[PDB]
RNA sequence: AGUGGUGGCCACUAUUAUUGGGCCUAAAGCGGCCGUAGCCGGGCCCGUAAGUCCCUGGCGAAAUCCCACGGCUCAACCGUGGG
RNA sequence: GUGGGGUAACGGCCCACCAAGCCGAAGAUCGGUACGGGCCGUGAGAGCGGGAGCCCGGAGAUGGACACUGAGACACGGGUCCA
């Protein structure tokens, strides 16, 4: 157990990556987002989506737009699509890759 | 199909009005219409009106008082925010204060004036003047 | 960045009414341009418009802004001193149109006539408060009214001038 | 395009803390990098021609520093672009002059006149702390300089305290703790140029400092952050603060 | 040149035009290519912002490490097994992470000899 | 029905809605594809400098009947023959062949003819470097 | 006449400065060397140390602004004082 | 002391229409039906606070804009102060 | 993804290997078009249209391409080739 410095419990496993942020060298500072996985094929990695309404001033209504980002999945958590999941801004790691999960708040089978 | 059951109340009264029949069964009766039937009645735009338990839904009769010009239902719920109610009372109003606006707030659905004096906006839900 | 014209034309150059007024209107004080009517028409709509804004404005910005507009409309001269918001819609082009300079210093007794004060005007032979003006389209304050006299150095100052003999029998005649 | 560092800086650009005419001129001074931001000093030089008006022309006032009669800090400094920052002291001793240099209600800098014998007190807030080899605790403040302590005297302070310190020759004076109901003067934000007691610290993760609360003397409660407040004193002020 | 910087492609393919020239402070420079030799060889490089580097093109010793903490100078016969690649171990190039042998025996290095200069691993 | 959609949630298609229809129209569709500067003679030019090579007369639109001068000139900003029509009371006599000519829009409708002359599109307003209108009173003398 | 609005005092350069308003009713706006001779009656000053930077001739007003200098020293108003004012005044050919 | 001609842009225009347009006879409902995403959806009880709303810190730099005051003769412009 | 390289610096920026991904009908890909903002013109306003003139940020030195000096450069008034 070290501090991440957000309110969440700990993985229960601990990996031996220098890239879990609970079990390596990596630290994080930015924001955290929350979010759904969508696609988990390639290794170590993790697609998270998210939702969310947007206005239009000519029109007084609502636009839903969908929004995606590409993070990192360290082993000891081991996301899955269906689960909500919890994002933080990181180091740059890849091309692309550039925000972690920290958390899986809840599974999909719930 | 029957979607909305607050705009059918209120065209449902001012159909009667401009005929200006004496007693209405607005057949879709919910706690939400019984609430903005008393707001206006807080300033006696009808008469008395009652709760009928159908089995079913519900259903409220009202006596009318011959003085509703017309009573429509803003349907796309617009959210605003204190400082431009002028803005959208003037959307649906003749006249200075001409009527009213009832409003949903985070205390309860009631009118506009107060809502104002209360500081507090909310949600449009009808008109009526 | 361009500054904007202070005037706002008609729109429409040809309504029999308004040519006409307008007309009457710069006869009775002898003005060289429609657009001096235009500006002046142009600060009674803006004085009107923040009127306006104002009467149905609500909160602490609304309310000092509202007691500056009165004040300044009262130190025009153009309200009396109790003077509320309501009666400034009533104000008319010609309440601005007597406080004109121009037309203060022949109401003055000063000129026979109107362009007779547009020449001492622009010729310099009047002072406001100590300091020469030479612009008849200038608005006067309520306070400075007191104040307009012929300008020292002009020959119109001393009591010899020979028009100054024909402005007098004006005066009393 | 641009290729590198800048030596310039237009009027209109210039921060919003400086009592200076804008459309008058077009370039000003920049300052060269010193002790305090951009954000919260200004040039002495438009200190001596407008704050003061003893020059009306640049080069008369660099003449007169160049004269060397001007002690900031008790140091005179020559330098026609040095930022003088906040809480400096400013003294001319041929005019046995003394001011305060302290930010507005509106977030602009004015000098307020303080006496003499305040004069050579400087109150700095305790940015960071670290450990340099040898052993030894130095400490950065908010304008930047540096003071060395002892292993055994690290605990004498923290980040947050303020040390009123004497410039004429560098000896440290009084430790203001940080703690609950001292005395504090905002620096920034919208609460600038108010002082008042401190009732609650809220720790805040995330990436926010701590936003204190201050209780002012009218006993009007009111939010800002932790890098904002500035204490000058346990119950009430040590300096002439307007 | 040597131009570390962005990819032609888009994440999802289109490919990107090029708006400007590439830029001195983003290019890279060659591969040091640490050989075993009987002397060490530097080159001492001028950096951004005018730091300095050195850079081993021929290495003779190493600097191996026990477990405990104590550390031995040797010299290093060969190279026995490079991760980064299979060419490297075959033309005896020294990089990190590469298993080597020395008159003590079996070393992992845990060095770069392109930035540090000098080799330092540890004994197996 | 009532005019659909109208909803909180429903923004994106009523804006998708409203861009499709705004093809319907002819004035934005013209101005965004530009239609004009890639049909233009003119290049978007008020006035453009011409050479004259040819006097022709037309005869107006029925029931109006009159005998219209105008000239024909060849551009020298890109080479195109258009006619330009004379306006006044012996303006061709002024004019003669090869002649530098300024010349602008006719100010139809659109910009289109004017009248009771057909697809005329432009007049002269200068004739090297004179303007016609004086030469029309006669107050100036041609070069 | 001439009349002080302001006199204060530059210890760090050791001069006076003098704010003042001359009344011309009339008259033409007056020369240099006679606001000078005139003004340096009532301080009790050097003429050498004294300058006039500025007399403002206002439009349609009698009254012109007046400001000027008066330094302790010869060799002061050298050092800073530049030199074409000092040509205005004649101090320097 | 400007006015006229031409060209391009907003209003005129509810002839682009959410506020705020029509589709039997004036151009405009496809021949009919099924249904995916999308959009809109009956009422009652418990929870939530994502939206929605009220308060509160930082921030959205200047110049331009509105207002009072001061300087330039007034104005425009500039400064001080409030939005 | 593994392991390295070079960089001021993290990273497919490169390289050796291991996998089959990732984007697209809430329109990729391709083309047409075009520096972005503070703003400005018009309108009662909803809105419509535009980014020339000042300030901020970005990019260029006929086109391309490549070095040295250097804290800072591929450097309008420094260098090398090609057209």
Redesign the interface.
């Given at each position: 157990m070290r501090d991440i410095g957000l309110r969440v419990q700990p993985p229960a496993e601990k990996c031996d990556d220098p890239k879990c942020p609970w079990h390596g060298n990596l630290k994080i500072h930015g924001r955290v987002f929350e979010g759904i996985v969508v696609s988990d094929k390639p290794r170590k990695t993790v697609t998270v989506e998210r939702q969310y309404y947007f206005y239009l001033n000519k029109y007084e209504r609502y636009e839903l737009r969908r929004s995606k980002i590409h993070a990192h999945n360290p082993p000891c958590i081991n996301a899955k699509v269906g689960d909500k999941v919890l994002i933080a801004e990181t180091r740059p790691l890849s091309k692309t890759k550039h925000f972690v999960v920290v958390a899986v708040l809840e599974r999909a089978e719930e | 199909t029957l979607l909305d059951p607050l705009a059918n109340a209120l065209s449902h009264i001012t159909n009667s009005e401009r005929v200006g029949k004496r007693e209405v069964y607005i057949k879709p009766a919910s706690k939400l219409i019984g609430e903005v039937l008393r707001v206006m009645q807080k300033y006696g735009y009808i008469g008395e009106f009652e709760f009928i338990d159908d089995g079913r839904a519900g259903v409220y009769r009202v006596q009318l008082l011959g003085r509703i010009n017309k009573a429509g239902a803003i349907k796309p719920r617009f959210p605003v925010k204190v400082?431009e109610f002028?803005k959208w009372e003037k959307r649906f109003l003749p006249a200075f204060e001409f009527g009213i606006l009832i409003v949903s707030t985070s205390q309860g659905v009631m009118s506009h004036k107060e809502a104002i004096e209360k500081g507090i906006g909310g949600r449009l839900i009808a008109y009526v003047y | 960045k361009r500054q904007r014209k202070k005037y706002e034309t008609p729109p429409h150059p040809w309504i029999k009414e308004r040519l006409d007024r307008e007309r009457v209107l710069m006869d009775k004080y002898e003005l060289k341009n429609k657009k001096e009517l235009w500006k002046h028409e142009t600060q009674l709509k803006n004085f009107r418009r923040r009127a306006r804004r104002l009467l149905?404005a609500?909160?602490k910005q609304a309310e000092i802004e509202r007691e500056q507009l009165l004040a300044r409309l009262k130190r025009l001269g153009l309200l009396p001193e109790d003077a509320v918001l309501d009666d400034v819609l009533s104000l008319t082009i010609e309440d601005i149109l007597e406080r004109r300079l121009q037309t203060i210093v022949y109401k003055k007794g000063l000129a026979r006539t109107m362009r007779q004060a547009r020449q001492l005007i622009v010729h310099?032979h009047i002072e406001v408060n100590?300091?020469?003006?030479?612009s008849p389209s200038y608005l006067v304050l309520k306070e400075e009214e007191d104040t307009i006299t012929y300008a020292?150095?002009s020959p119109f100052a001393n009591p010899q001038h020979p028009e100054r003999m024909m402005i007098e029998k004006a005066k009393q005649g | 395009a641009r290729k590198g560092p800048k030596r310039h800086l237009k009027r209109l650009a210039a921060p919003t803390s400086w009592y200076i005419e804008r459309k008058a001129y077009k370039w000003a001074v920049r300052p060269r990098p010193g002790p305090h931001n951009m954000r919260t000093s200004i040039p002495l030089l438009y200190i001596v021609r407008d704050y003061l008006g003893y020059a009306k022309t640049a080069r008369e006032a660099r003449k007169i520093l160049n004269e060397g009669k001007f002690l900031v800090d008790g140091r005179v400094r020559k330098d026609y672009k040095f930022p003088v920052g906040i809480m400096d002291v400013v003294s001319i001793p041929e005019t046995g002059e003394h001011y305060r240099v302290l930010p507005n209600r509106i977030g602009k800098l004015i000098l307020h006149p303080i006496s003499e014998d305040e004069a050579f007190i400087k109150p700095l807030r305790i940015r960071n702390k670290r450990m340099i080899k040898g052993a030894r605790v130095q400490l950065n403040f908010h304008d930047g300089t540096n003071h060395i302590v002892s292993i055994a005297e690290k605990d004498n302070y923290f980040t947050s305290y303020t040390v009123l310190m004497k410039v004429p020759e560098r000896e440290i004076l009084e430790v203001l703790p940080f703690e609950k109901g001292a005395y504090v003067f905002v620096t920034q934000g919208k609460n600038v140029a108010r002082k008042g007691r401190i009732v609650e610290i809220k720790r805040f993760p995330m990436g926010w400092p701590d936003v204190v609360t201050i209780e002012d003397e009218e006993g009007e409660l009111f939010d800002t952050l932790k890098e904002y407040a500035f204490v000058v004193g346990t119950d009430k002020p040590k300096i002439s603060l307007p | 040149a040597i131009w570390q910087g962005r990819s032609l492609k888009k994440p999802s393919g289109g490919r990107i035009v090029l708006a400007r020239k590439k830029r001195k402070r983003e290019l890279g420079r060659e591969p040091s290519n640490t050989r075993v030799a009987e002397q060490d060889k530097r080159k001492i490089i001028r950096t951004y912002g005018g730091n300095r580097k050195v850079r081993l093109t021929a290495a003779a010793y190493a600097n191996v490490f026990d477990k405990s903490g104590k550390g031995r100078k040797v010299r290093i016969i060969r190279v026995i097994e490079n991760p980064a690649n299979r060419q490297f171990a075959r033309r005896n190039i020294i990089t990190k992470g590469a298993i080597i042998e020395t008159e003590i025996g079996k070393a992992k290095v845990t060095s770069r000899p392109g930035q540090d200069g000098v080799v330092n691993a540890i004994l197996l | 029905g009532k005019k659909a959609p109208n909803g909180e949630f429903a923004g994106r298609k009523l804006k998708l809605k409203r861009k499709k229809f705004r093809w319907s129209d002819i004035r934005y569709k013209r101005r965004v594809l530009r239609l004009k500067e890639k049909s233009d003679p003119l290049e978007g030019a008020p006035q453009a400098r011409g050479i004259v090579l040819e006097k022709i007369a037309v005869e107006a639109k029925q029931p109006n009947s009159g005998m219209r001068k105008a000239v024909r000139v060849q551009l020298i900003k890109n080479g195109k023959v258009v006619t330009a029509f004379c306006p006044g009371d012996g303006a061709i006599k002024f004019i003669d062949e090869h002649d530098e000519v300024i010349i602008e829009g006719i100010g139809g409708p659109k910009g289109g003819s004017m009248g009771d002359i057909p697809g005329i599109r432009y007049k002269v307003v200068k004739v090297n470097r004179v303007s016609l209108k004086e030469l029309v009173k006669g107050r100036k003398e041609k070069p | 006449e001439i009349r002080i609005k302001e006199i204060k005092e530059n210890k760090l350069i050791g001069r006076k400065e003098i704010y003042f308003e001359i009344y011309h009713?009339?008259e033409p706006t007056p020369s240099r060397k006679d606001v000078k001779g005139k003004l340096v009656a009532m301080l009790d000053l050097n003429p050498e140390t004294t300058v006039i930077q500025y007399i403002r001739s206002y439009?349609?007003?009698?009254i012109s602004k007046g400001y000027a200098k008066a330094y302790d020293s010869k060799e002061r108003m050298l050092y800073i004082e530049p030199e074409y004012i000092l040509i205005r005044d004649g101090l320097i050919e």
């Amino acid at each position: 157990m070290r501090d991440i410095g957000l309110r969440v419990q700990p993985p229960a496993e601990k990996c031996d990556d220098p890239k879990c942020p609970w079990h390596g060298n990596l630290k994080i500072h930015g924001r955290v987002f929350e979010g759904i996985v969508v696609s988990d094929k390639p290794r170590k990695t993790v697609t998270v989506e998210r939702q969310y309404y947007f206005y239009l001033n000519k029109y007084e209504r609502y636009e839903l737009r969908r929004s995606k980002i590409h993070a990192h999945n360290p082993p000891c958590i081991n996301a899955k699509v269906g689960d909500k999941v919890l994002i933080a801004e990181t180091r740059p790691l890849s091309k692309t890759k550039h925000f972690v999960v920290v958390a899986v708040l809840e599974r999909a089978e719930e | 199909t029957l979607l909305d059951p607050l705009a059918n109340a209120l065209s449902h009264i001012t159909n009667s009005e401009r005929v200006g029949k004496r007693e209405v069964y607005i057949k879709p009766a919910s706690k939400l219409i019984g609430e903005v039937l008393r707001v206006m009645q807080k300033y006696g735009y009808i008469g008395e009106f009652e709760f009928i338990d159908d089995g079913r839904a519900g259903v409220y009769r009202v006596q009318l008082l011959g003085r509703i010009n017309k009573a429509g239902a803003i349907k796309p719920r617009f959210p605003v925010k204190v400082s431009e109610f002028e803005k959208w009372e003037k959307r649906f109003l003749p006249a200075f204060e001409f009527g009213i606006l009832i409003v949903s707030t985070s205390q309860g659905v009631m009118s506009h004036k107060e809502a104002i004096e209360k500081g507090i906006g909310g949600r449009l839900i009808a008109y009526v003047y | 960045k361009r500054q904007r014209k202070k005037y706002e034309t008609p729109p429409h150059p040809w309504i029999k009414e308004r040519l006409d007024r307008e007309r009457v209107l710069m006869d009775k004080y002898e003005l060289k341009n429609k657009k001096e009517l235009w500006k002046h028409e142009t600060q009674l709509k803006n004085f009107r418009r923040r009127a306006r804004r104002l009467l149905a404005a609500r909160g602490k910005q609304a309310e000092i802004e509202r007691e500056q507009l009165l004040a300044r409309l009262k130190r025009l001269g153009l309200l009396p001193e109790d003077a509320v918001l309501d009666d400034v819609l009533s104000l008319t082009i010609e309440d601005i149109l007597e406080r004109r300079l121009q037309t203060i210093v022949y109401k003055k007794g000063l000129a026979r006539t109107m362009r007779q004060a547009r020449q001492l005007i622009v010729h310099g032979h009047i002072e406001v408060n100590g300091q020469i003006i030479r612009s008849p389209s200038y608005l006067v304050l309520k306070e400075e009214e007191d104040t307009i006299t012929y300008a020292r150095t002009s020959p119109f100052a001393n009591p010899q001038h020979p028009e100054r003999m024909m402005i007098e029998k004006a005066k009393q005649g | 395009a641009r290729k590198g560092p800048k030596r310039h800086l237009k009027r209109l650009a210039a921060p919003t803390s400086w009592y200076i005419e804008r459309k008058a001129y077009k370039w000003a001074v920049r300052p060269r990098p010193g002790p305090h931001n951009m954000r919260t000093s200004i040039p002495l030089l438009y200190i001596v021609r407008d704050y003061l008006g003893y020059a009306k022309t640049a080069r008369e006032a660099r003449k007169i520093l160049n004269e060397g009669k001007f002690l900031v800090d008790g140091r005179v400094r020559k330098d026609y672009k040095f930022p003088v920052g906040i809480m400096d002291v400013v003294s001319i001793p041929e005019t046995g002059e003394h001011y305060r240099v302290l930010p507005n209600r509106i977030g602009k800098l004015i000098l307020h006149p303080i006496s003499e014998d305040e004069a050579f007190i400087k109150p700095l807030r305790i940015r960071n702390k670290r450990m340099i080899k040898g052993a030894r605790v130095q400490l950065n403040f908010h304008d930047g300089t540096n003071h060395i302590v002892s292993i055994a005297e690290k605990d004498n302070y923290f980040t947050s305290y303020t040390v009123l310190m004497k410039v004429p020759e560098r000896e440290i004076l009084e430790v203001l703790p940080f703690e609950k109901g001292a005395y504090v003067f905002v620096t920034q934000g919208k609460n600038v140029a108010r002082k008042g007691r401190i009732v609650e610290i809220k720790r805040f993760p995330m990436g926010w400092p701590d936003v204190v609360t201050i209780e002012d003397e009218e006993g009007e409660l009111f939010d800002t952050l932790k890098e904002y407040a500035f204490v000058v004193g346990t119950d009430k002020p040590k300096i002439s603060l307007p | 040149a040597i131009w570390q910087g962005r990819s032609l492609k888009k994440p999802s393919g289109g490919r990107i035009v090029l708006a400007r020239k590439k830029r001195k402070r983003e290019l890279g420079r060659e591969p040091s290519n640490t050989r075993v030799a009987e002397q060490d060889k530097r080159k001492i490089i001028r950096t951004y912002g005018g730091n300095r580097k050195v850079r081993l093109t021929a290495a003779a010793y190493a600097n191996v490490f026990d477990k405990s903490g104590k550390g031995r100078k040797v010299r290093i016969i060969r190279v026995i097994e490079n991760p980064a690649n299979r060419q490297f171990a075959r033309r005896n190039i020294i990089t990190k992470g590469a298993i080597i042998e020395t008159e003590i025996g079996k070393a992992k290095v845990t060095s770069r000899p392109g930035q540090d200069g000098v080799v330092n691993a540890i004994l197996l | 029905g009532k005019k659909a959609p109208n909803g909180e949630f429903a923004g994106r298609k009523l804006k998708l809605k409203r861009k499709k229809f705004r093809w319907s129209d002819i004035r934005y569709k013209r101005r965004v594809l530009r239609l004009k500067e890639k049909s233009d003679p003119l290049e978007g030019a008020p006035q453009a400098r011409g050479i004259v090579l040819e006097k022709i007369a037309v005869e107006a639109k029925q029931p109006n009947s009159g005998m219209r001068k105008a000239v024909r000139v060849q551009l020298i900003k890109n080479g195109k023959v258009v006619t330009a029509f004379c306006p006044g009371d012996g303006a061709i006599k002024f004019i003669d062949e090869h002649d530098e000519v300024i010349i602008e829009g006719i100010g139809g409708p659109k910009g289109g003819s004017m009248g009771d002359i057909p697809g005329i599109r432009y007049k002269v307003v200068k004739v090297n470097r004179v303007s016609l209108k004086e030469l029309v009173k006669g107050r100036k003398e041609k070069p | 006449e001439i009349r002080i609005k302001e006199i204060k005092e530059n210890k760090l350069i050791g001069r006076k400065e003098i704010y003042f308003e001359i009344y011309h009713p009339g008259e033409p706006t007056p020369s240099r060397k006679d606001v000078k001779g005139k003004l340096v009656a009532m301080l009790d000053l050097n003429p050498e140390t004294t300058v006039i930077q500025y007399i403002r001739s206002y439009f349609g007003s009698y009254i012109s602004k007046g400001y000027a200098k008066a330094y302790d020293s010869k060799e002061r108003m050298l050092y800073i004082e530049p030199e074409y004012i000092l040509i205005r005044d004649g101090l320097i050919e």
